[PDB]
């Protein structure tokens, strides 16, 4: 078994044995500045990379993961060719790198486009919640309607209607828009049309926030409570239970397989078991009320009346990091792989280096990447991605930042 040298040059050896895919499979674990290397080892080594479309194959593994790569593929053409010489591929790699470098660049100083959407109406002057897309925006106005905007020429696709109060919170889905309102109700709307499916009574004061995903919804209210519903259909929806422990309005609720996190103006974030709906902890520490969380895997990020953004570990419940810089109430906030984007009362939105922030070696002052100021009133909601922020605010505008 064990008697044959430094011998084997595997990748010239294998094709010569019938077995190309193996040598290709081996090379395929390589990064580019290194696949470059294999390319240049010897002529056959070269050949295996060319005949195995090892760029195609390495660029299709990029897309199949790194958020950014799936992105640039979807946008601006080139993803057109995936899933044909092989050089087109190798030659393209440096440009996709340069892209990512210029985005992550101008996007840390100034990558504007805004595209103001002015909405109108009597009553209001506020877009409370918004949820966003590759070709539509679902927005809960204060006029009591949800307005749906075409993402391209920005026109208004559908004015949905039949809510007593301002639409305070909402969730897309690929079946049903759901909203919570000043009128103490939660609503189900078919996402294609504008048709109300179900409407839940249950609460007794402004449904302030809902979060939604999979078979169950979580919901919360000025009435101090959270309700957990397992939904069997838009038509169905049953109250699993009600969580009582907060001492004031529950401003924000959110959700993953292992925990349900809520926050109120009682200055606490409470963490509930997603399956037993029991208390587990309190995240105490904000000096004033919490206006906004997000929660993903390990992390929970909150915005406060005390003007700071806090960063928590969900398990021990420690605060990892305090973010100062907002000069007014932090009304809305979102994580992501590499950033935290928050919206304040003076209509300013701030971009934070998430990865820097999660490392205590990084000093307070340089955690806020350049700060963005294109709103007249309060910033109510935002949701972003690899290349876009798209924000609501008082001054009844949706902004689409690049």
């Amino acid at each position: 078994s064990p008697a044959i040298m430094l011998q084997r040059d595997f990748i010239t050896a294998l094709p010569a044995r019938g077995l190309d895919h193996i040598a290709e499979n081996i090379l395929s674990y390589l990064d580019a500045k290194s696949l470059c290397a294999a390319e240049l080892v010897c002529k056959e080594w070269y050949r295996v990379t060319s005949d195995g479309m090892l760029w195609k194959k390495l660029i299709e593994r990029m897309v199949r993961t790194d958020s950014l790569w799936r992105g640039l593929a979807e946008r601006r053409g080139w993803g057109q060719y995936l899933f044909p010489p092989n050089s087109f591929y190798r030659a393209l790699y440096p440009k996709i790198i340069q892209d990512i470098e210029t985005i992550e660049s101008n996007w840390r100083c100034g990558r504007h486009s805004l595209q103001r959407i002015h909405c109108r109406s009597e009553t209001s002057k506020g877009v409370y919640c918004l949820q966003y897309d590759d070709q539509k925006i679902v927005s809960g106005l204060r006029d009591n309607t949800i307005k749906i905007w075409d993402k391209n020429t920005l026109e208004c696709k559908r004015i949905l209607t039949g809510h007593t109060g301002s639409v305070l919170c909402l969730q897309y889905d690929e079946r049903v828009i759901i909203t919570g309102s000043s009128d103490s109700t939660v609503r189900v709307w078919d996402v294609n049309t504008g048709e109300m499916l179900n409407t839940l009574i249950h609460h007794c004061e402004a449904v302030l926030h809902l979060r939604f995903n999979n078979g169950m919804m979580v919901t919360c209210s000025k009435d101090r409570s959270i309700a957990v519903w397992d939904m069997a259909s838009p038509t169905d929806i049953t109250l699993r239970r009600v969580l009582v422990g907060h001492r004031a309005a529950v401003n924000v609720v959110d959700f993953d397989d292992k925990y349900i996190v809520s926050a109120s103006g009682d200055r606490t974030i409470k963490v509930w078991n997603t399956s037993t709906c029991e208390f587990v902890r309190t995240l105490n520490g904000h000096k004033r009320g919490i206006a906004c969380l997000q929660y993903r895997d390990r992390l929970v990020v909150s915005g406060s009346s005390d003007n700071t953004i806090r960063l928590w570990d969900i398990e021990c419940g420690a605060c990892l990091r305090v973010l100062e810089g907002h000069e007014e109430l932090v009304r809305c906030i979102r994580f992501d792989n590499k950033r935290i984007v928050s919206g304040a009362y003076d209509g300013k939105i701030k971009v934070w280096d998430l990865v820097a922030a999660l490392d205590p070696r990084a000093p307070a002052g340089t955690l806020c990447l350049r700060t963005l100021v294109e709103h007249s009133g309060r910033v109510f909601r935002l949701q972003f991605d690899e290349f876009q922020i798209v924000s609501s605010s008082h001054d009844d505008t949706i902004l689409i930042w690049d």
């Binding site: 919170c169 302030l208 926030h209 200055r267 109510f380």
Partner: peptide
């Protein structure tokens, strides 16, 4: 006006 959608503490 605060927001109809957020409320601080106590009552």
């Amino acid at each position: 006006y605060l927001d109809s959608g957020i409320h601080s503490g106590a009552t």
